[PDB]
Design a protein around this ligand. Structure first.
Ligand code: CLA
Ligand code: CLA
Ligand code: CLA
Ligand code: CLA
Ligand code: CLA
Ligand code: CLA
Ligand code: CLA
Ligand code: CLA
Ligand SMILES: CC(C)=CCC/C(C)=C\CC/C(C)=C\CC/C(C)=C\CC/C(C)=C\CC/C(C)=C\CC/C(C)=C\CC/C(C)=C\CC/C(C)=C\CC1=CC(=O)C(C)=C(C)C1=O
Ligand SMILES: CC1=C(/C=C/C(C)=C/C=C/C(C)=C/C=C/C=C(C)/C=C/C=C(C)/C=C/C2=C(C)CCCC2(C)C)C(C)(C)CCC1
Lengths: 105, 421, 38, 137, 246, 226, 37, 176
């Protein structure tokens, strides 16, 4: 015997509902590092930094990270097009967002 | 076809047999050492092929440099040959003594070698063989202190052969190992950390053997000893039989959990080594991905990498939490008061450590009859089975059956004394 | 609880001395039905 | 349905020239892979670093490119992080790190080539499986 | 400094959990050299007791705090941190941490046997001291806030396997059943919360060992992402703190 | 009983497992739509045409499914009391392609909701590991639209709602049950056919001993006495 | 293979170590020739 | 091909929970328990001195009494185990009852599964299993393994339906 205000709030999975801004591009504030491997030379070092300087308000703001190299910027641009941003999701983040995600093997 | 039981009383033939099977034991020592240096390839993990004695020979630090396979090939050929010929030297003996003629009626002989039911002579024969172990034991001591060292896996750098000085000869320490809980990491004999304990622990045996060999030589058993034990020939087997069983177990378990004695470098990594090795391997991996190891929170709330032990220290989390008792040369330098130092971890971690983790973690003692390496589910393209699993496995088996033997022959000594014969 | 640990050990060893001293026993020793050798 | 030339007609360099291997070689590839790899690279999947495989597609996205032989050969001699900014010779097998990976000490140029060949022919045979272990996972 | 108490010694009776001591010398002395420079910190954290305040006879309650029995033994304690100490424009001291240790102790409440597991938090901490730098031990103060996540993570799979990021989405065993009441459990919810903690220094000393005092924090229990509402908690104990920059 | 004969009709004992594995119903049902549809009716109209009892025979809960021990085992303490419609749930995609859902084999106690294309392609699924998910329902946006018997001739969008049906789809036709009248637990039960069979086969098997015991005991009088 | 100059004998050395087992074998043949008692 | 049978059963039927297979499991293990005690008791209670040489390879027709004692066995058991119906004719028949009685059940149990009629569930538990997530028993832990058996093993094991199951979809514990 219930109502919609209660039910709807609960009838919500935080991860399920992100399935819209997510799946078409890489989310810049939360996704584990291993999502960076699907692009040319983006993994090792940039991945480390993009993850550590989060969160960002606009995909382009990556460019501002400090200590960067000239080329580094150059490559971000070409890929910038594959990124996206969305509000930080409490879940995905407070549990080693980088490696918690099943090491598929 | 109890053939070997018809021989019971004609000691003239047993000598022929005991010295015949005593010839096989040595034969195997050569046939295997030579078979090994045969298949054996230099610079490939001793244990990734399938060897067992050589590893023993390098244990005694007979031929090796800092944890380096072998610089000198030869040392093994000596062993392979010697024992293979000692097998003929005795094959001759066993055969002869078995076929040319019985014993006990040679007057000057019966004075040097007597028979059963004679406590004073059995005792005397016993002590004898005790004077021999007293020696062999002490020889091991010689080979570590004034001879071409022994292989210390501990401090520092690589622990090549090193000669010992003033072994732990404290009276207390030695038997303390005997008086300690055989549980959780602490097994009396297995707890042996420092190689120096091991040397000194041998000195005392010999003195104890010898001081005993002679003891029974001169003395016949007291009353209490006479009314507890029987004296049939079959019954002495029951004593000796069950003794060996315990030990089979002893060594087996001794095999799985290494003491410097069984340097994991030849034998391979310890069941726990692998797990603990897998934890450490990944701290680094993510540490390189800039992951903060102290604040990690695994789906359980226990932190993926670091948690505590009931007595409150830090230990790699994950099922490998049950092996925090594990200690080796690679994982130790990160050890300190209160457990693992979160500051040596992320700051002072040398590379050669990741290597060992990866190698061990990679060659998990896990294997099958098809020599398939790794989890029961892997593909047959990787061959391996940690020597330890081989020694532990086969040897367990014998320690068991053998016990079945303690029951069968000791229960039959109750049938001699009055039961069924 | 330390009081408990102690109590136990007494009990345990108690019944050990009864096993041990029950065998070494000069009195009962190894007495069978078919033959007594004393 | 037999092993064919096309099957072994693998890319040799970045531009567009190719070499067609032989029967003899192919087999030495396995034998070698199993010798100093499989243990860590079973069925073409990293055990130490599961998020990085040896599938063909993932190799092309490396830095420098690795969908061909010359690239792999370079890697086996000297290692390169997926991006090419770190020297991982003190961590990964390399003819330059023989002193630490004794299994490497014996190896020769001919063997690298073959090992490389094994890694590029496999996927045409196994398909998805060699990747993340399908049959295997 | 160096009198080595080996890990060999400690593994015996559990000392790790008890923070280091500061017995006689009571010299709250530590300079204004701060005004002169900066300082970092390494802090140990240990408790003496936990308190669950649960009681539901609504409208007739002032203070309902019951003591507690530790089911998770010698775990609590463990908190080995790093933190920076800053001076604000008004002469007070503020704290900011780096590693962020946290723990998971469970306690059995006498009254119902009802076991309660709390995630002991100190993560994201922020600290404060009253007025000035002229005194330290005399008048001891340090107070700030926590951030408290959830005992369980998105990956946690329950008895029928069904959570956030993994796990079924329903009660499989009963296909044609009513989804309403079960909703609660078939969907997991992640909670992040209020943290409150305070400090009191009872012994400051020398020039190397700097603080030690009375602990006191208040957090929330585990809710299991969608089960019974959390029972409130209050924790008290002792602590250790060292400092030195130049 | 189990296979069905002229003496084992339908409205008397229910359906057969052979009609479920055979998509025997789905077939007739289909032909009633391509036939009427081609005659100038709208999809909505055609479905609303096919008699419902026919669609009921299609719900999987009517195939002897599960139930070694389920005391009263009437079908109704399973689904509940059925009162519903011959609703066909049409799952289309964002481009309009008509998606087809895979059915649950009477062999499994639980099945993984999956949506296929008309060619056998995989379009939607309900991920277990949402992290590296690629075929989610939200990422591809599905939609359920009901052109069925009176009870439901409309359309739906929400991913939570849409999903529910996918699973209830897996059971074939979709129905609504008066669960509350018997406090149904929501677990499947078995028809009189399964019950009549399980009984009569065991008994028969059991009478084999009876045939062999009394037989031999008949021909060995003297042996019996010893 | 590291036997150097003896190279020649891998063979015999290889089938060598089994013999301890074949000892068990004769034992039964010994018995067969002696009618089993 | 038989082991695969076993497993198949465990996943879709949880045959181990069936009570019938349990009884079957009772007789088979009881058949072997009898086979040991009977065979060992005999052999060990054999008549003393029946052979001077003292080995035991003889008998004859007139050896009416046979080579061993029921009176001693009796007391042996009675004082060790506590029970011992001593009446040879019963001992042997009971040895027919245990094994055979068992397999009949087991066979019954299977006529049941033939009709996907199983003992694969505990309504009582399932119910409280869904309304509450902090409650788990071995009953449950097992039902989890099964689904794992079913998901991974049915697409290769049953080629005709042609199951296509996308990586994500498969049930899977963290890290493995
Ligand atoms: C300390 C060593 C030891 C010694 C010296 C003896 C000595 C004796 N035993 Mg005892 N025994 C022992 C250990 C020992 N046993 C153990 C550990 C057990 C428990 C298994 C037994 C169980 C036992 C039994 C059950 C019996 C004896 C009997 C006897 C007497 C036997 C004469 C005979 O007929 O042999 C004949 C022996 C054989 C035909 C050997 C069979 C060996 C197996 C089948 C070989 C397995 C090898 C396999 C093929 C290898 C595969 C390859 C591998 C690489 C994988 C003799 C006094 C007999 C007796 O009456 O005692 C007075 C008797 O019945 N023993
Ligand atoms: C562990 C090994 C073993 C050993 C050492 C023995 C030993 C013995 N057995 Mg037993 N036996 C065994 C296993 C063993 N058996 C098993 C497993 C069974 C069950 C199949 C039996 C069944 C059995 C029976 C049934 C009988 C014996 C008997 C005997 C005794 C025979 C003495 C003799 O002169 O024979 C005659 C000797 C020969 C035919 C010669 C064999 C020659 C060997 C193979 C030569 C090897 C070459 C040599 C090393 C070359 C050296 C050259 C130099 C330059 C180096 C002897 C003590 C007999 C007995 O009554 O004893 C009291 C008897 O009847 N045994
Ligand atoms: C006098 C005391 C005595 C001693 C010292 C031994 C010693 C030994 N016995 Mg023996 N035994 C004795 C009395 C003794 N026994 C008696 C009274 C009996 C009853 C008859 C037995 C019955 C017996 C049996 C049934 C068996 C043994 C076995 C063994 C050997 C076991 C392995 C070992 O411990 O190796 C440790 C090794 C050593 C101590 C090395 C000794 C070699 C050195 C280098 C001396 C070489 C000297 C040589 C003679 C020089 C002369 C040269 C010439 C040109 C002039 C060991 C050599 C077992 C065996 O395997 O047989 C060989 C066995 O099965 N013994
Ligand atoms: C387990 C360890 C072991 C043990 C405890 C023994 C123990 C023994 N060995 Mg054995 N042995 C072993 C291993 C072992 N051996 C091995 C491995 C081998 C092979 C290398 C041998 C080879 C061996 C040989 C070759 C001999 C022994 C002998 C002996 C006995 C010597 C005692 C003595 O005082 O001799 C001192 C020697 C004497 C008193 C010799 C007297 C000479 C006789 C009486 C001459 C008869 C000739 C006469 C002229 C004939 C007239 C006939 C007419 C028709 C014309 C002793 C029982 C000896 C033995 O049994 O003979 C007595 C012996 O000859 N052993
Ligand atoms: C007194 C007991 C004793 C013990 C505990 C050890 C222990 C050890 N030895 Mg030593 N050894 C001993 C006696 C002992 N040895 C003697 C007498 C000798 C001379 C024969 C040697 C010669 C020796 C060598 C040559 C070597 C070793 C090595 C080793 C290590 C081997 C790893 C292993 O597998 O061990 C196996 C351990 C056991 C089977 C333990 C048995 C436990 C006790 C003693 C059994 C008690 C029961 C017994 C029935 C008591 C009868 C008493 C009576 C009153 C009833 C290990 C630390 C190796 C090493 O590398 O070390 C430097 C090595 O190369 N040992
Ligand atoms: C080869 C092994 C060995 C064997 C078989 C025997 C056998 C015997 N000894 Mg001897 N003994 C030995 C070695 C051996 N001893 C040594 C090396 C010494 C020197 C310390 C002695 C000193 C000795 C004395 C002083 C006496 C005996 C006595 C006896 C008899 C005792 C009766 C009995 O068992 O009562 C029951 C037995 C017990 C209550 C003891 C159970 C002990 C367990 C199984 C072993 C514990 C071993 C130890 C912890 C392991 C070492 C570990 C290492 C790492 C340090 C018996 C015939 C007595 C005798 O003959 O009287 C005249 C006697 O008074 N022995
Ligand atoms: C190589 C050295 C070594 C050896 C020889 C052993 C040996 C043994 N281990 Mg230990 N272990 C070791 C290392 C070793 N371990 C290490 C390094 C670890 C670290 C993880 C462990 C961890 C471990 C665990 C976790 C356990 C064992 C157990 C056992 C025993 C199993 C057999 C049994 O059931 O006995 C039954 C007992 C006997 C045969 C008694 C022999 C003593 C005398 C002769 C009889 C006394 C009689 C009287 C009735 C009993 C009093 C006993 C007393 C405890 C009350 C066996 C004695 C098991 C056990 O039962 O614990 C003791 C067990 O659960 N071990
Ligand atoms: C031909 C036989 C037969 C058959 C096929 C049915 C069939 C049915 N009955 Mg009817 N019933 C029968 C005889 C039969 N009944 C008889 C004789 C009576 C007494 C008058 C009843 C009384 C009855 C009632 C009161 C009800 C039914 C109901 C039902 C339906 C129940 C569905 C169900 O879940 O059953 C469940 C089946 C079981 C629980 C059987 C489990 C198997 C047994 C108990 C195992 C025994 C163990 C083993 C033998 C012992 C160990 C052996 C030893 C040697 C080791 C079903 C259509 C219900 C209904 O009408 O639905 C609305 C209902 O309420 N029946
Ligand atoms: C209330 C209250 C507090 C009461 C107090 C009770 C109490 C203190 C009880 C303690 C006593 C005790 C040790 C009891 C054990 C009882 C027990 C184990 C009963 C078994 C019942 C049972 C399940 C039996 C069948 C199982 C089975 C297949 C057994 C093996 C067959 C068997 C026993 C054969 C014996 C046998 C074998 C022979 O081969 C010969 C030849 C003879 C002759 C012979 O007999
Ligand atoms: C069964 C039986 C028995 C037994 C037997 C025995 C115990 C035997 C033994 C035997 C033996 C114990 C033997 C040994 C042998 C040896 C040999 C035969 C050797 C050889 C060698 C050689 C030839 C050499 C080598 C080499 C070298 C050194 C160097 C390099 C090269 C080469 C490789 C050439 C009896 C009689 C009791 C009775 C009946 C039955």
């Amino acid at each position: 015997a219930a109502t919609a205000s209660t039910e709807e709030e609960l009838v919500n999975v935080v991860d399920e509902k992100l399935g819209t801004a997510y799946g078409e591009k890489i989310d810049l504030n939360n996704t584990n590092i291993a999502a960076f491997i699907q692009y040319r030379g983006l993994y090792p070092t940039l991945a480390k930094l993009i993850v550590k300087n989060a969160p960002y308000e606009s995909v382009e703001d990556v460019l501002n990270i400090p200590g960067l190299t000239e080329r580094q910027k150059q490559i971000l641009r070409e890929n910038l097009e594959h990124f996206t941003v969305t509000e930080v999701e409490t879940a995905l983040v407070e549990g080693g967002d980088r490696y918690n995600n099943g090491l598929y093997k | 076809w109890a053939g070997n039981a018809r021989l019971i009383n004609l000691s003239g033939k047993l000598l022929g047999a005991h010295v015949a099977h005593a010839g096989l034991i040595v034969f195997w020592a050569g046939a295997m050492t030579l078979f090994e240096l045969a298949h054996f390839i230099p610079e490939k993990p001793m244990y990734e092929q399938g060897l067992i004695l050589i590893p023993h020979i390098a244990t005694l630090g007979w031929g090796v440099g800092p944890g380096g396979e072998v610089v000198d090939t030869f040392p093994f050929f000596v062993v392979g040959v010697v024992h293979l010929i000692s097998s003929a030297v005795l094959g001759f003996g066993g055969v002869y003594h078995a076929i040319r003629g019985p014993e006990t009626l040679e007057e000057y002989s019966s004075f040097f070698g007597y028979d059963w039911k004679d406590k004073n002579k059995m005792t005397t024969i016993l002590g004898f063989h005790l004077i021999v172990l007293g020696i062999g034991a002490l020889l091991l001591v010689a080979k570590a202190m004034f001879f071409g060292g022994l292989y210390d896996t501990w401090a520092p750098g690589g622990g090549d052969v090193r000669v010992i000085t003033n072994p732990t000869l404290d009276p207390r320490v030695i038997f303390g190992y005997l008086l300690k809980s055989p549980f959780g990491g602490e097994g009396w004999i297995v707890s042996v950390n420092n190689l120096e304990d091991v040397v000194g622990g041998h000195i005392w045996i010999g003195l104890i053997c010898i001081a005993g060999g002679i003891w029974h030589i001169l003395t016949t058993p007291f009353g209490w000893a006479r009314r507890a034990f029987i004296w049939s020939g079959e019954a002495y087997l029951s004593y000796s039989l069950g003794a060996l069983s315990m030990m089979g177990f002893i060594a087996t378990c001794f095999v799985w959990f290494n003491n410097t004695v069984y340097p994991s470098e030849f034998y391979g990594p310890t069941g726990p080594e692998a797990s603990q090795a897998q934890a450490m391997t990944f701290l680094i991996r993510d540490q390189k991905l800039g992951a903060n190891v102290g604040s990690a929170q695994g789906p359980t709330g226990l932190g993926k990498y670091l948690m505590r032990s009931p007595t409150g220290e830090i230990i790699f989390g994950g099922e490998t939490m049950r092996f925090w008792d594990f200690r080796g040369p690679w994982l130790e330098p990160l050890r300190g008061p209160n457990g693992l130092d979160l500051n040596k971890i992320k700051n002072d971690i040398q590379p050669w450590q990741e290597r060992r983790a990866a190698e061990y973690m990679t060659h998990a003692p896990l294997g099958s009859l098809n020599s398939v390496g790794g989890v029961a589910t892997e593909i047959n393209s990787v061959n391996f089975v940690s020597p330890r699993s081989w020694l532990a496995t086969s040897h367990f088996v014998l320690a068991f059956f053998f016990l079945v033997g303690h029951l069968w022959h000791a229960g039959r000594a109750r049938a001699a004394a009055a039961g069924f014969e | 609880m330390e009081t408990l640990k102690i109590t136990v050990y007494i009990v345990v060893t108690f019944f050990v001395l009864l096993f041990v001293f029950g065998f070494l026993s000069g009195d009962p020793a190894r007495n069978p039905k078919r033959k007594d050798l004393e | 349905a037999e092993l064919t030339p096309e099957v072994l007609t693998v890319p040799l360099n970045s531009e567009g020239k190719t070499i067609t291997l032989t029967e003899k070689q192919y087999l030495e590839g396995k034998r070698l892979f199993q010798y100093a790899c499989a243990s860590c690279h079973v069925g073409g999947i990293t055990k130490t670093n599961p998020s990085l495989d040896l599938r063909t597609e993932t190799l092309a996205l490396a830095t420098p490119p690795r969908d061909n032989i010359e690239g792999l050969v370079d890697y086996m001699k000297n290692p390169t992080t997926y991006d090419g900014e770190q020297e991982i010779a003190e961590v990964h097998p390399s003819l330059r790190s023989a002193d630490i990976f004794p299994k490497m000490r014996n190896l020769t140029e001919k063997d690298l080539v073959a090992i490389a060949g094994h890694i590029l022919v496999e996927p045409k045979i196994l398909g998805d499986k060699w990747g993340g272990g399908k049959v295997y996972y | 400094a160096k009198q080595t108490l080996t890990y060999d010694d400690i593994v015996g009776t559990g000392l790790a959990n008890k923070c280091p001591t500061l017995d006689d010398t009571a010299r709250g002395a530590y300079p204004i050299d701060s005004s002169q420079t900066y300082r970092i910190a390494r802090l140990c954290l240990q408790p003496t007791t936990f308190l669950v305040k649960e009681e539901p006879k609504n409208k007739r309650q002032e203070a309902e705090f019951v003591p507690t029995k530790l089911v998770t033994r010698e775990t609590t304690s463990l908190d080995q941190i790093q933190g920076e100490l800053k001076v604000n424009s008004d002469g007070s001291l503020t704290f900011v941490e780096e590693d962020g240790i946290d723990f998971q102790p469970v306690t059995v409440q006498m009254a119902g046997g009802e076991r309660i597991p709390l995630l002991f938090t100190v993560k994201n901490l922020v600290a404060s001291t009253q007025p000035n730098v002229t005194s330290i031990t005399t008048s001891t103060d340090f107070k700030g806030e926590f951030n408290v996540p959830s005992y369980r993570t998105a990956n946690f799979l329950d008895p029928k396997g069904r959570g956030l990021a993994s796990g079924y989405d329903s009660a499989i065993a009963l296909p044609q059943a009513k989804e309403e009441e079960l909703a609660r459990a078939n969907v997991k919810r992640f909670s992040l919360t209020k943290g409150q903690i305070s400090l009191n220094v009872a012994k400051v000393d020398g020039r190397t060992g700097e603080i030690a005092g009375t602990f006191e924090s208040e957090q929330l229990s585990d809710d299991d992402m969608g089960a019974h509402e959390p029972h409130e908690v209050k924790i008290q104990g002792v602590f250790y703190a060292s400092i030195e920059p130049a | 009983m189990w296979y069905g004969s002229a003496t084992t009709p339908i409205e008397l004992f229910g359906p057969t497992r052979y009609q479920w594995d055979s998509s025997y119903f789905q077939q007739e049902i289909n032909r009633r739509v391509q036939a009427s549809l081609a005659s100038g009716a709208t999809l909505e109209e055609a479905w609303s045409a096919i008699p419902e009892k026919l669609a009921f025979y299609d719900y999987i809960g009517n195939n002897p499914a599960k139930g070694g021990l389920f005391r009263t085992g009437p079908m109704n303490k399973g689904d509940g009391i059925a009162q519903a419609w011959k609703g066909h749930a049409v799952f289309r995609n964002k481009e309009g392609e008509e998606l087809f859902v895979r059915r649950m084999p009477a062999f499994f106690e639980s099945f993984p909701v999956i949506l296929t294309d008309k060619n056998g392609v995989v379009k939607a699924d309900i991920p277990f590991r949402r992290a590296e998910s690629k075929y989610s329902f939200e990422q591809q946006g599905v939609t359920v639209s009901f052109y069925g018997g009176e009870l439901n001739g409309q359309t739906f969008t929400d991913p939570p709602t849409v999903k529910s049906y996918a699973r209830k789809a897996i059971f074939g036709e979709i129905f609504e049950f008066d669960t509350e009248t018997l406090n149904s637990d929501g677990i499947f039960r078995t028809s009189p056919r399964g019950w009549f069979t399980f009984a009569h086969a065991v008994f028969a098997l059991l009478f084999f001993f009876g045939h062999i015991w009394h037989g031999a005991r008949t021909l060995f009088r003297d042996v019996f006495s010893g | 293979k590291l036997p150097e100059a003896y190279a020649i004998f891998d063979p015999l050395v290889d089938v060598l170590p089994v013999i301890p087992v074949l000892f068990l074998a004769l034992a039964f043949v010994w018995q067969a020739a002696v009618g089993f008692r | 091909a038989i082991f695969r049978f076993l497993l198949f059963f465990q996943g879709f039927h949880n045959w181990t929970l069936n009570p019938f297979h349990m009884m079957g499991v009772a007789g088979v293990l009881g058949g072997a328990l009898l086979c040991a005690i009977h065979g060992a008791t005999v052999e060990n209670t054999l008549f003393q001195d029946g052979e001077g040489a003292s080995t035991f390879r003889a008998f004859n027709p007139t050896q009416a009494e046979e080579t061993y004692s029921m009176v001693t066995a009796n007391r042996f058991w009675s004082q060790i185990f506590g029970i011992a119906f001593s009446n040879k004719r019963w001992l042997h028949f009971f040895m027919l009852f245990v094994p055979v009685t068992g397999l009949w059940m087991s066979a019954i149990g299977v006529v049941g599964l033939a009709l996907n009629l199983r003992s694969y569930d505990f309504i009582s538990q399932e119910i409280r299993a869904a309304e509450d997530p902090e409650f788990e028993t071995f009953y449950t832990k097992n039902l989890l393994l099964n689904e794992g058996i079913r998901a991974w093993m049915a697409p290769q094991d049953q080629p005709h339906e042609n199951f296509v199951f996308p990586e994500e979809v498969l049930p899977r514990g963290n890290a493995l």
